[PDB]
Design an enzyme around this catalytic site. Structure first.
Site, PDB file in Angstrom:
ATOM      1  N   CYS A 108       9.944  -4.041  -5.431  1.00 14.70           N
ATOM      2  CA  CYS A 108       8.768  -3.154  -5.407  1.00 14.70           C
ATOM      3  C   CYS A 108       9.129  -1.695  -5.203  1.00 14.70           C
ATOM      4  O   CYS A 108       9.688  -1.319  -4.157  1.00 14.70           O
ATOM      5  CB  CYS A 108       7.774  -3.571  -4.309  1.00 14.70           C
ATOM      6  SG  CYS A 108       6.306  -2.508  -4.268  1.00 14.70           S
ATOM      7  N   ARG A 111       7.205   0.848  -2.167  1.00 12.08           N
ATOM      8  CA  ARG A 111       7.280   0.452  -0.764  1.00 12.08           C
ATOM      9  C   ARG A 111       7.167   1.566   0.275  1.00 12.08           C
ATOM     10  O   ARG A 111       7.034   1.285   1.468  1.00 12.08           O
ATOM     11  CB  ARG A 111       8.516  -0.407  -0.507  1.00 12.08           C
ATOM     12  CG  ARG A 111       8.354  -1.837  -0.979  1.00 12.08           C
ATOM     13  CD  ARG A 111       9.622  -2.630  -0.715  1.00 12.08           C
ATOM     14  NE  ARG A 111      10.679  -2.271  -1.666  1.00 12.08           N
ATOM     15  CZ  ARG A 111      11.966  -2.556  -1.499  1.00 12.08           C
ATOM     16  NH1 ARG A 111      12.363  -3.210  -0.418  1.00 12.08           N
ATOM     17  NH2 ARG A 111      12.853  -2.200  -2.423  1.00 12.08           N
ATOM     18  N   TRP A 280      -1.917   0.289  -6.240  1.00 14.00           N
ATOM     19  CA  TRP A 280      -2.419   1.020  -7.394  1.00 14.00           C
ATOM     20  C   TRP A 280      -1.348   1.069  -8.476  1.00 14.00           C
ATOM     21  O   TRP A 280      -0.168   0.830  -8.203  1.00 14.00           O
ATOM     22  CB  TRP A 280      -2.901   2.419  -7.018  1.00 14.00           C
ATOM     23  CG  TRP A 280      -1.916   3.230  -6.253  1.00 14.00           C
ATOM     24  CD1 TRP A 280      -0.851   3.909  -6.762  1.00 14.00           C
ATOM     25  CD2 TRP A 280      -1.921   3.489  -4.839  1.00 14.00           C
ATOM     26  NE1 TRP A 280      -0.181   4.561  -5.756  1.00 14.00           N
ATOM     27  CE2 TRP A 280      -0.817   4.323  -4.565  1.00 14.00           C
ATOM     28  CE3 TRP A 280      -2.749   3.094  -3.780  1.00 14.00           C
ATOM     29  CZ2 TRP A 280      -0.519   4.772  -3.273  1.00 14.00           C
ATOM     30  CZ3 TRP A 280      -2.452   3.533  -2.498  1.00 14.00           C
ATOM     31  CH2 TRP A 280      -1.350   4.367  -2.255  1.00 14.00           C
ATOM     32  N   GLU A 285       3.307   0.479 -16.075  1.00 14.19           N
ATOM     33  CA  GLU A 285       2.934  -0.935 -16.078  1.00 14.19           C
ATOM     34  C   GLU A 285       1.934  -1.179 -17.211  1.00 14.19           C
ATOM     35  O   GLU A 285       2.062  -2.141 -17.969  1.00 14.19           O
ATOM     36  CB  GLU A 285       2.357  -1.381 -14.729  1.00 14.19           C
ATOM     37  CG  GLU A 285       3.265  -1.100 -13.531  1.00 14.19           C
ATOM     38  CD  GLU A 285       2.672  -1.633 -12.214  1.00 14.19           C
ATOM     39  OE1 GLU A 285       2.615  -2.879 -12.069  1.00 14.19           O
ATOM     40  OE2 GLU A 285       2.281  -0.818 -11.330  1.00 14.19           O
TER      41      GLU A 285
HETATM   42  C1  HEM Z   1       0.338   0.909  -3.644  1.00 16.76           C
HETATM   43  C2  HEM Z   1       0.955   1.134  -4.804  1.00 16.76           C
HETATM   44  C3  HEM Z   1       2.023   0.175  -5.394  1.00 16.76           C
HETATM   45  C4  HEM Z   1       2.755   0.464  -6.488  1.00 16.76           C
HETATM   46  C5  HEM Z   1       2.697   1.767  -7.341  1.00 16.76           C
HETATM   47  C6  HEM Z   1       3.633  -0.666  -6.739  1.00 16.76           C
HETATM   48  C7  HEM Z   1       4.533  -0.753  -7.774  1.00 16.76           C
HETATM   49  C8  HEM Z   1       5.149  -1.901  -8.220  1.00 16.76           C
HETATM   50  C9  HEM Z   1       5.706  -2.135  -9.538  1.00 16.76           C
HETATM   51  C10 HEM Z   1       5.707  -1.151 -10.731  1.00 16.76           C
HETATM   52  C11 HEM Z   1       6.242  -3.358  -9.543  1.00 16.76           C
HETATM   53  C12 HEM Z   1       6.918  -4.014 -10.763  1.00 16.76           C
HETATM   54  C13 HEM Z   1       5.807  -4.845 -11.404  1.00 16.76           C
HETATM   55  C14 HEM Z   1       6.213  -5.418 -12.731  1.00 16.76           C
HETATM   56  O1  HEM Z   1       6.791  -4.665 -13.556  1.00 16.76           O
HETATM   57  O2  HEM Z   1       5.932  -6.626 -12.960  1.00 16.76           O
HETATM   58  C15 HEM Z   1       6.031  -3.965  -8.235  1.00 16.76           C
HETATM   59  C16 HEM Z   1       6.439  -5.217  -7.807  1.00 16.76           C
HETATM   60  C17 HEM Z   1       6.098  -5.855  -6.631  1.00 16.76           C
HETATM   61  N1  HEM Z   1       5.247  -5.375  -5.635  1.00 16.76           N
HETATM   62 FE1  HEM Z   1       4.564  -3.402  -5.535  1.00 16.76          FE
HETATM   63  N2  HEM Z   1       3.410  -1.641  -5.771  1.00 16.76           N
HETATM   64  C18 HEM Z   1       2.420  -1.166  -4.922  1.00 16.76           C
HETATM   65  C19 HEM Z   1       1.913  -1.888  -3.858  1.00 16.76           C
HETATM   66  C20 HEM Z   1       2.276  -3.163  -3.447  1.00 16.76           C
HETATM   67  C21 HEM Z   1       1.648  -3.940  -2.382  1.00 16.76           C
HETATM   68  C22 HEM Z   1       0.413  -3.480  -1.552  1.00 16.76           C
HETATM   69  C23 HEM Z   1       2.306  -5.115  -2.281  1.00 16.76           C
HETATM   70  C24 HEM Z   1       2.049  -6.284  -1.291  1.00 16.76           C
HETATM   71  C25 HEM Z   1       1.364  -6.156  -0.138  1.00 16.76           C
HETATM   72  C26 HEM Z   1       3.380  -5.114  -3.271  1.00 16.76           C
HETATM   73  C27 HEM Z   1       4.312  -6.121  -3.474  1.00 16.76           C
HETATM   74  C28 HEM Z   1       5.109  -6.293  -4.585  1.00 16.76           C
HETATM   75  C29 HEM Z   1       5.914  -7.466  -4.866  1.00 16.76           C
HETATM   76  C30 HEM Z   1       6.105  -8.762  -4.018  1.00 16.76           C
HETATM   77  C31 HEM Z   1       6.574  -7.158  -6.216  1.00 16.76           C
HETATM   78  C32 HEM Z   1       7.534  -8.088  -6.971  1.00 16.76           C
HETATM   79  C33 HEM Z   1       6.701  -8.884  -7.962  1.00 16.76           C
HETATM   80  C34 HEM Z   1       7.619  -9.862  -8.630  1.00 16.76           C
HETATM   81  O3  HEM Z   1       8.577 -10.356  -7.953  1.00 16.76           O
HETATM   82  O4  HEM Z   1       7.393 -10.151  -9.841  1.00 16.76           O
HETATM   83  N3  HEM Z   1       3.317  -3.916  -3.952  1.00 16.76           N
HETATM   84  N4  HEM Z   1       5.373  -3.032  -7.460  1.00 16.76           N
HETATM   85  C1  LIG Z   2       7.648 -13.180 -12.986  1.00 16.95           C
HETATM   86  N1  LIG Z   2       7.265 -11.760 -13.065  1.00 16.95           N
HETATM   87  C2  LIG Z   2       5.852 -11.636 -13.461  1.00 16.95           C
HETATM   88  C3  LIG Z   2       5.013 -11.672 -12.202  1.00 16.95           C
HETATM   89  C4  LIG Z   2       4.502 -12.873 -11.685  1.00 16.95           C
HETATM   90  C5  LIG Z   2       3.746 -12.871 -10.517  1.00 16.95           C
HETATM   91  C6  LIG Z   2       3.504 -11.662  -9.869  1.00 16.95           C
HETATM   92  C7  LIG Z   2       4.009 -10.465 -10.384  1.00 16.95           C
HETATM   93  O1  LIG Z   2       3.774  -9.270  -9.749  1.00 16.95           O
HETATM   94  C8  LIG Z   2       4.114  -8.003 -10.330  1.00 16.95           C
HETATM   95  C9  LIG Z   2       3.464  -6.988  -9.417  1.00 16.95           C
HETATM   96  C10 LIG Z   2       3.265  -7.310  -8.071  1.00 16.95           C
HETATM   97  C11 LIG Z   2       2.649  -6.413  -7.205  1.00 16.95           C
HETATM   98  C12 LIG Z   2       2.233  -5.175  -7.682  1.00 16.95           C
HETATM   99  C13 LIG Z   2       1.606  -4.266  -6.830  1.00 16.95           C
HETATM  100  C14 LIG Z   2       1.193  -3.043  -7.352  1.00 16.95           C
HETATM  101  C15 LIG Z   2       1.427  -2.744  -8.708  1.00 16.95           C
HETATM  102  N2  LIG Z   2       1.055  -1.547  -9.255  1.00 16.95           N
HETATM  103  N3  LIG Z   2       2.023  -3.659  -9.505  1.00 16.95           N
HETATM  104  C16 LIG Z   2       2.429  -4.855  -9.025  1.00 16.95           C
HETATM  105  C17 LIG Z   2       3.036  -5.757  -9.894  1.00 16.95           C
HETATM  106  C18 LIG Z   2       4.768 -10.471 -11.549  1.00 16.95           C
END
Ligand code: HEM
Ligand SMILES: CNCc1cccc(OCc2ccc3ccc(N)nc3c2)c1
Ligand code: HEM
Ligand SMILES: CNCc1cccc(OCc2ccc3ccc(N)nc3c2)c1
Ligand SMILES: C[C@H](O)[C@H](O)[C@H]1CNc2nc(N)[nH]c(=O)c2N1
Ligand SMILES: C[C@H](O)[C@H](O)[C@H]1CNc2nc(N)[nH]c(=O)c2N1
Ligand SMILES: [Zn+2]
Lengths: 411, 407
Positions: A108, A111, A280, A285
């Protein structure tokens, strides 16, 4: 044992000690790196040490390690485990847990915001209708008329794995996808399978390009139920371009609230299989992945035609050119409507600061380079040049299998 | 133990068995992944030789043959006797092609089998090395129709008689630190440019000065040599829409010829083995021109385009980055100098991956390096799961000579 990462653009070297607190496996070995692999009912036997480790962490964080409050809490959890086979987290512990799961999410980039997370405790919820209510409140609070606020709603934890709460939607708000008899797809191809399930479960599909999917909600291991999010709660943004007037005529829009709902939250060995959370959008994305992935809306072509680019040879970089304008359009549209968004330059720059702060205050910051680097313009963002170390800390957010593959239908 | 890789764009799943052959170590562990980290005796020797000869004779369908066993015997005897051994030309050529084949960070490996190998193991002096290198440059350049090549200097003996090319590439531009605080020419080469001067070079103190060669033979002190300008094909950079672009005064050379790596074949070490292919557009336009620690021209280009550089959210850097990269490709193609764009090259690599999975059981690949530095997810490799592991023969990094040279 100390580990160093180097930023090759600044030569700033950092030292990781936090990776020593890591237990969970990576997928990698001394002989193979699985760094680019996407994805590489529990007994008392293992539960208390997992509980204990969490509670040691929590009590350290609040500067009470070894205190009587610490010891009594450990005792109390132990007894509850051997009496009931599980335990309940205090509100403080829950809030701490959820924030730390986000803090620990190595993939993420957002963070820096981790400590500002609004936690909604939905552990008193019992039915799908109850879940619908909580989720509606989540969406309203989080959206906040465009001024987005990070939030998470936490439903009851797993017990025997036969009474799981699950949100069947991968995100609370997503557009339907429909496969047509001619092989083409209407709407979001990413959502075809889920759309079908909803339709089967009785959803009447408008069959448009941007139909907001119904919530499919499972409480206490019962069969999921359909609910429609009130449209007045679903904030959407028409996509236009600041200089290209034809862009609006592509008829595109996106929703404002990215709210992932298919992940599992792990805290002190407890499993929260329904924990929808939202932040947000980073512009790319939507603008790179959601519009321009070939397996998604796939609009590069039509955008490129309208720009009158040389689409004959790829070496004209017509794809690259069209991709930038679409991403410009997304950012412009959101900003113009006062809906919170962040560009990939701003977000990566913030991430680097956050990361360095984390090294100093915490001894490290686990980070997955493959996911941190934005899907366009990689090397002109500062994360590209940043060495990172990836490892798994708890509390964590984990993948879980899609509920339709595991669910036992009641009928 | 049998591993699968999935393409998330196409759902195509490949199965990897080749990784089980891997010998060297990745740097990762079960507890930590180091995938984004840039740099993670007679008795040692014969198994190394054996392993190589085993795969060499298997490749020619003569595994378990008289010829095989004999060579194994001959090399074993020669090791026992000489404490080292020499490759047959056939083995040398095979080894070099396979070092390329195994380079998990190289997107251009679809061309691996078509490598021209120049055996320079009869070389004794820096002048000799210069002659060999000039021949390499001329051959590989081929007036703009580039051809992949490697020139192999004598293998290490006791590490006191090392052959080394001190340049990181045969052809690079000088970099000078101004009193003004900035940097003129290529900032990556400031230190090497200094060592050239310290050794006697006469810098023109320009912005695109072709660096001289610094050649080390048999462990002796390195000597300077100027590559005949007529052998150094350069391309003036112009944009096919922006006429003002040429006034930026940019050019680049057509021949990327990496000269600072170590070639290992059958335990034998070639500290001096400059090799060359041809450029992917982004190498120059994205990294060389727009890296902050490089020519860093994004700012000036953006200004010339009169973009709103007030906020990052206008994505002006992105816009400029694209045009710059359009121009690099345009200039090379116009002057008929071989070049590949990141789309074509990544597409080619996917096909090559499938070929290797199909005909070899896998293909070691480092996603962090294979995915191009712009427009990542609109190239097919982004959605391609890869497995990274080290196979031999291989190219390895090695310390810069000055940090090591016993003068
Ligand atoms: C507040 C603004 C936030 C932004 C701009 C942001 C941004 C991102 C982005 C761009 C990704 C990659 C997503 C993708 O390409 O599939 C990501 C992944 C992730 N985010 Fe954040 N995020 C935010 C908030 C949060 C919050 C609030 C949480 C949880 C409480 C969180 C937890 C995660 C997790 C667990 C992943 C990994 C998802 C995966 O393993 O596929 N994020 N985030
Ligand atoms: C296996 N990768 C695809 C896959 C499966 C399940 C969850 C997920 O989450 C991506 C993700 C998770 C959290 C986010 C929080 C904020 C944001 N802007 N994008 C976010 C994007 C992505
Ligand atoms: C013929 C066309 C070729 C193309 C288009 C190509 C492309 C590339 C690119 C883009 C990289 C990333 C380099 C960087 O970002 O600095 C790379 C790395 C590499 N290439 Fe290739 N290459 C070609 C030929 C060759 C040849 C002939 C060899 C050896 C005989 C080779 C061996 C390597 C090695 C060892 C690396 C990794 C070096 C490192 O780890 O820094 N390549 N290649
Ligand atoms: C670690 N990055 C710096 C570093 C150190 C040593 C060698 C090297 O070479 C990269 C490389 C190697 C071979 C290439 C062949 C063709 C090409 N177009 N680029 C190529 C780029 C790059
Ligand atoms: C195969 C590869 O690991 C996969 O496409 C990953 C690469 N990096 C990513 N990075 C982000 N942020 N999101 C993604 O979906 C992916 N996909
Ligand atoms: C920190 C990071 O490892 C570094 O910037 C890497 C990333 N990927 C790369 N990929 C290529 N092709 N070339 C590079 O020099 C790098 N540098
Ligand atoms: Zn790894």
């Amino acid at each position: 044992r100390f580990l160093k990462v180097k930023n090759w653009e600044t030569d700033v070297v950092l030292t990781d000690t936090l990776h020593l607190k890591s237990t969970l496996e990576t997928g990698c070995t001394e002989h193979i790196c699985m760094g680019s692999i996407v994805l590489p009912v529990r007994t008392k036997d293992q539960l208390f040490p997992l509980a204990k480790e969490f509670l040691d962490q929590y009590y350290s964080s609040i500067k009470r390690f070894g205190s009587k409050a610490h010891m009594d809490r450990l005792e109390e959890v132990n007894k509850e485990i051997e009496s009931t086979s599980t335990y309940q987290l205090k509100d403080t512990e829950l809030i701490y847990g959820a924030k730390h799961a986000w803090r620990n999410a190595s993939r993420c980039v957002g963070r820096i915001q981790w400590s500002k997370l609004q936690v909604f405790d939905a552990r008193d919820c019992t039915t799908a209708h109850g879940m619908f209510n909580y989720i509606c409140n989540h969406v309203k609070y989080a959206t906040n008329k465009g001024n987005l606020r990070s939030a998470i709603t936490i439903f009851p934890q797993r017990t025997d794995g036969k009474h799981d709460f699950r949100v069947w939607n991968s995100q609370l708000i997503r557009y339907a996808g429909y496969k047509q008899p001619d092989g083409s797809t209407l709407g979001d191809p990413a959502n075809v399978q889920f759309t079908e399930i909803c339709i089967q479960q009785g959803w009447k599909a408008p069959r448009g390009r941007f139909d907001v999917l119904p919530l499919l909600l499972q409480a206490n291991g019962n069969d999921p139920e359909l609910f429609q999010i009130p449209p007045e709660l679903v904030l959407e943004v028409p996509i236009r371009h600041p200089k290209f007037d034809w862009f609006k005529d592509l008829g595109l829009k996106w929703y404002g609230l990215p709210a992932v709902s298919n992940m599992l939250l792990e805290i002190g060995g407890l499993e929260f299989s329904a924990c929808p959370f939202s932040g947000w959008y980073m512009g790319t994305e939507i603008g790179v992945r959601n519009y321009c992935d070939n397996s998604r809306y796939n609009i590069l072509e039509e955008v490129a035609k309208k720009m009158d680019l040389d689409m004959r040879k790829t070496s004209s970089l017509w794809k690259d050119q069209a991709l930038v304008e679409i991403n410009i359009a997304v950012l412009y549209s959101f900003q113009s409507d006062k809906v919170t968004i962040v560009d990939h330059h701003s977000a990566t720059e913030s991430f680097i600061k956050h990361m360095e702060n984390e090294y100093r205050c915490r001894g490290g910051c686990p980070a997955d380079w493959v996911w941190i680097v934005p899907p366009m313009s990689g090397s002109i963002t500062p994360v590209f040049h940043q060495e990172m170390l990836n490892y798994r800390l708890t509390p964590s957010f984990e993948y879980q299998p899609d509920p339709w593959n595991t669910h036992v239908w009641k009928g």
